[PDB]
Amino acid sequence: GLSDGEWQQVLNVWGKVEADIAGHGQEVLIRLFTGHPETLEKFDKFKHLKTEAEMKASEDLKKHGTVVLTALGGILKKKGHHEAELKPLAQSHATKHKIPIKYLEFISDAIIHVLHSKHPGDFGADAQGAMTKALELFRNDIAAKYKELGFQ
């Protein structure tokens, strides 16, 4: 649950992402894959990537980064009223991709890391607080659907 002022911070930060969605999406996935190499094994189309240089050179990884952040941005713009947008993603990630909630924690922290890396000194403590709360809400509502499905 976020206040109006917190949502305003989230959507202000998101403007930074929308200026370069592919570059942000690429770096988020690279941070996930290099920090948590077990996550790469869930992607049949990226498991061939052995080095970060190959990851950086992969145009399909940048494409998928655009898909991921476009979906997340659509959810964030609903300011919590995201049941219709979130349900299909919860279902596909639990039942088809088999993504444990832990990996959603990993990618949430990766987003925070990338924002500081690309905007050092321009991602203030209030903005980090609000973005963190928004990603916690996203993860918590996914977790509720995971529990319904019995997925661990």
Nearer to ligand HEM, 99 or 114 (CB): 99
Show the tokens assigned to 92: 């596909």
Question: Does 107 participate in binding ligand HEM (rule CB under 6 A)?
Answer: yes
Q: Which of 55, 89, 90, 130 binds ligand HEM (CB under 6 A)?
A: 89
When the beta carbons of 5 and 67 are compared against ligand HEM, the nearer one is: 67
Q: State how far the Cα of 22 lies from the Cα of 127, in Å rounded to an integer.
A: 21
Rounded to an integer, what distance in angstroms lies between the CA atom of residue 24 and that of residue 21? 5
- Taking the C-alpha atoms of residue 75 and residue 36, their distance in angstroms, rounded to an integer, is 25
Among 13, 55, 99, 115, binds ligand HEM (CB under 6 A): 99
| Helix or strand (DSSP H, E) at 126 | helix 125-149
* Footprint on this chain of ligand HEM (rule: CB under 6 A): 39, 42-45, 67-68, 71-72, 89, 92-93, 97, 99, 103-104, 107
